Write a protein that binds this ligand. Structure first.
Ligand SMILES: Nc1ncnc2c1ncn2[C@@H]1O[C@H](COP(=O)(O)OP(=O)(O)OP(=O)(O)O)[C@@H](O)[C@H]1O
Ligand SMILES: Nc1ncnc2c1ncn2[C@@H]1O[C@H](COP(=O)(O)OP(=O)(O)OP(=O)(O)O)[C@@H](O)[C@H]1O
Ligand SMILES: Nc1ncnc2c1ncn2[C@@H]1O[C@H](COP(=O)(O)OP(=O)(O)OP(=O)(O)O)[C@@H](O)[C@H]1O
Ligand SMILES: Nc1ncnc2c1ncn2[C@@H]1O[C@H](COP(=O)(O)OP(=O)(O)OP(=O)(O)O)[C@@H](O)[C@H]1O
Lengths: 311, 311, 311, 311
């Protein structure tokens, strides 16, 4: 098995230009906010499985590895909002995250704000990052709760720490609720999936950078004339499912004697990870499924919005 | 009576290839998830009485017998979700299950998440398995609650422990609620009942492996030309009712002098366990009921879905 | 009695060349229509009791037995139009027939067309067959309603599924109503009854194939020099009455000790099934009725048209 | 069989100059209407089976293939009016056609006009095309309903989108009902069938372009001195029946060993598709039928008007 090759095949990262555009903007946000005056407050979108958490873990690596190895400073922070977040609920988890506090046996929402606003200059927080903004909409109706939104405006105007919010593409109507939240968050971006399969894409260079990143030491055989056809036939532009199927083929090749990912084990990888796909999506690998041109069609605009049509 | 023969007739297990396919996939999931990076998160389906609980008890036997006899490690865990599960309700029972905690006199849902995420690396949990996913749909309407779903995504992204969910076939629309839950659960399988009676089935080999597994030391007389006809006439493909009727015949044969299951006591076993069957299902054993070809017809696709049509 | 012999005497089928000509044309229509472009849309005629329903049940046997035993595909469909069919009335019964829908508590005729045109590629309908086209003419006048005709053109041009219409010979003036229906239905055939008695007919071979098909294991005595004379004297060319009288003799022979259909029990069969015949038709079997040559005269052209003269 | 040759023999298109005259006029109508001021509103006629639907599918190919592959724009639209169209009935189907709406559970005819007039600039409709205008006349009487006509004038004057109406030649009296509809539709054309067989016709070049379009790789033998005689004897000028008989011969030649359509299999094609023809039409192919000069007579003016004489 040689589990080093397995973990080294799973932990692989390809920097598409949108990702480095993002990380450049967050360093821009980090040492552009001067902690004297009003911050910049970027907002990042992206659908399910487009690489968001990988982006922020890249960011806390390249921004906080040496400063977390040096001492208890914690300049950048990483937060997910729990579902249907009460303002005291999000505030207390954001508080027990940073520092070494006890911090949550009292739930009073004024005095823990006191403790968090005295601690946010005490350890020297350079940036606060929130992962999951779509948790503030109701399940069965599309009312949105902005107790946490006005609380986040309060902690923004209290201490001038920059905030970078990630979230689903349907989570922006929450920002359409509070207009002061809408104006305070100026930079919204678009981390949409891979666009086309027609040729000379960013998809190409991503694919062959992943190919040299793979643990097989000669060639992976991928990013070819017909392979990206069935690859884009399998995953829409969907980064998580593409990488998942690729990893599930790579483990199958390293289970036995195999020199590269080839045409006997990539099929069984299509057999496993075909579960999340819809019924009208077509299964292209086993016996005779040639792929029409309409099925490599680019992803629509409401690609991170199908959590929202039904209600 | 000789109760050893009774318990040894009840506890009998036949490994059909779908079961070993499952258990191979869960060892694949166990030492494929590296506990560094993102897990694999299999999902298992199956209707009522298709052998699910027997599969997981086989699994905790073959995976945790020696490690539970060695010390307090508890690498694999077994959980059922209680009905209409609150997120704190499922979390506290999942917490009192593992370790030796007190764990449930406080119901605060942030600090018990704290305790569970510090304990899930402390004892070294290799796998968490949930039995009953269909308990998250409402009785009278088909609203589904995904407080527990977003909480399970939270505990998935917090600590990278693999999760194997079992459940009813109509319970997958719950996974259709949250698209991030849908994408995070890639491997969905199909544990459907026995398909046909026409000949050269998996049903055959299952039947005669059960026949050699029976406590009668010469031959059970089953898996014959006409016996599987009335067997598939009694149980649809339904593993629980087939095994139940077989056990109820075996006890009747060992109650008195009988050398094998035969044509006087298998009838009284059809007399007892005919209660759960529908009205239009035909009762084939007593006096003259010859079985038409249409009544050995394979089970439909909505065979684990008749909890769902009426509302 | 031995009811196997009774059902095996009733369910007997003789393939005259017009029937196999038909079934060849409907397989021609099935895999000639490519479901990309414009279909072929055969029309079949035939008077009362000429074997139409038996032909289509033969067809769904030989075309859909294995595919209906395999799963829920339903490639070929079987429809009768109810009398004075409203377009929503025919559409809703054609809808509840295929698939497993609820489908008829709403009667809106635009949204059920929506459901039927999304379902006709969803299950993969290869062919739609309609039995009763003569139900679209008014009783007391010969106005014909073509709401259903233009609706059938609409569903024909919407999805390109081939349609095979059966019906009475006077039902073709309905197709003379809409000229686009007239041009879209190109292949009209003629399933007329048996032509003559005079010798070397198709009637001969049909008769002795029925004779070997009968449950009597030596000879039926039929298709002889004088027996087909009184047979064609009884039934005009009328398949239903000929087969009905033959079956009513065969049951009378198997009621008691009889070795073949003979000249004591075939008479009582003429006594029973002489009711539907006209007054000027002559009753030839009992005491002395020798049959003239003019009474074996071939059937006229308006043999499926006597529902139409009076108004 | 080689189904590629079958579909490639069915999908063949010959551009007679009237068709390219039409398509030139609809591009003229598309980018002559400026969407600022009053549109041009062409009207197209033609009898049954003269190639209308093929013309518009050619048009949406050559006008909307790349723009439908690019994104959700849908510049040109394709509509058939259902039979006896209510204004809300035609409006709701024209609405669910374009865009991705729900659109038809409310039938209120003022608010769906609101939605359609805000959506017709939202997606950027360049052209609306209606197939079936003859559905607005009553069956049994020649009253015509112009609720849909005044509604179409309303949507024409509301947003200035050009409209191209196809329809039967007897459907123009509907346009004679509303004089404002009559004046708003200026360009009416004449897509009549093929005129003569006497020599040097457009029929000639059409016939040999179809001959080189056929799947037989040497010569089809057609468009000769005597073959177009019996061809025009079979089909009047009728494009659908001519192409249908030609296709039914081509399949018969490719069923067995045959090198071209010849004089044994073209006859059986005349045997099949002779059903839609009238009684006084003469059947010319089998044994000795030489064709008089009067039977190649040009089609009359009321050739798309025989749906209209009887009432
Ligand atoms: N740049 C990249 N190069 C290689 N693999 C990547 C890259 N980005 C993402 N992936 C893969 O995609 C998978 C999904 O990552 P991630 O969870 O960050 O997406 P996401 O949009 O955050 O999904 P979710 O929002 O549901 O958490 C990861 O397992 C990772 O291996
Ligand atoms: N492989 C097998 N060999 C022999 N017997 C089996 C096998 N699988 C299941 N059974 C029998 O079927 C019965 C039902 O088992 P089980 O409860 O696991 O099914 P289930 O689908 O989990 O039902 P439920 O979901 O309602 O608990 C058991 O009593 C067991 O004896
Ligand atoms: N080929 C055949 N061989 C033997 N019997 C036949 C054959 N065709 C028809 N019959 C007999 O004729 C009887 C009438 O059949 P059927 O109802 O199909 O005729 P039909 O024209 O459809 O009458 P209707 O239109 O009134 O239903 C059947 O009971 C059947 O037994
Ligand atoms: N230019 C052409 N070249 C070759 N074949 C053609 C051409 N035009 C039409 N056809 C053939 O004629 C047949 C009838 O086409 P179409 O339905 O468009 O006529 P139509 O007048 O629209 O009939 P309807 O109005 O009843 O739909 C088609 O199957 C097509 O194959």
């Amino acid at each position: 098995t040689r589990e080093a090759r397995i973990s080294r095949a799973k932990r692989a990262f390809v920097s598409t230009p949108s990702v480095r555009k993002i990380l450049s903007y967050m360093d821009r946000c980090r040492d552009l906010s001067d902690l004297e005056s009003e911050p910049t407050c970027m907002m990042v979108y992206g659908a399910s499985g487009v690489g968001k958490t990988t982006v922020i873990k890249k960011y806390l690596n390249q921004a906080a590895a040496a400063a977390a190895a040096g001492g208890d400073i914690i300049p950048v922070l990483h937060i997910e909002l729990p579902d249907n977040a009460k303002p005291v609920d999000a505030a207390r988890e954001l508080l027990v995250e940073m520092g070494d506090p006890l911090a949550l046996y009292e739930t009073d929402l004024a005095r823990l704000t006191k403790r968090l606003t005295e601690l946010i200059p005490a350890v020297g927080v350079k940036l606060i990052i929130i992962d999951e903004f779509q948790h503030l909409v109701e399940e069965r109706s599309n009312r949105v709760l902005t107790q946490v939104g006005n609380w986040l405006k309060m902690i923004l105007n209290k201490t001038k720490c920059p905030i970078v919010i990630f979230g689903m593409p349907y989570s922006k109507v929450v920002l359409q609720a509070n207009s002061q939240l809408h104006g305070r968050f100026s930079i919204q971006v678009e981390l949409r999936p891979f666009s086309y399969q027609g040729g000379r894409g960013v998809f190409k260079t991503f694919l062959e950078y992943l190919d040299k990143a793979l643990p097989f030491e000669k060639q992976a055989g991928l990013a070819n004339e017909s392979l990206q056809k069935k690859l884009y036939a399998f995953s829409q532009g969907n980064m998580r499912s593409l990488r998942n199927l690729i990893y599930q083929a790579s483990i199958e090749a390293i289970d036995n004697q195999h020199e590269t990912i080839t045409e006997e084990d990539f099929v069984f990888a299509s057999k496993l990870t075909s579960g999340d796909k819809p019924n009208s999506w077509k299964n292209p690998f086993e016996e005779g499924v040639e792929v029409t041109e309409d099925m490599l069609r680019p992803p629509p605009k409401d690609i991170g919005w199908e959590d929202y049509l039904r209600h």
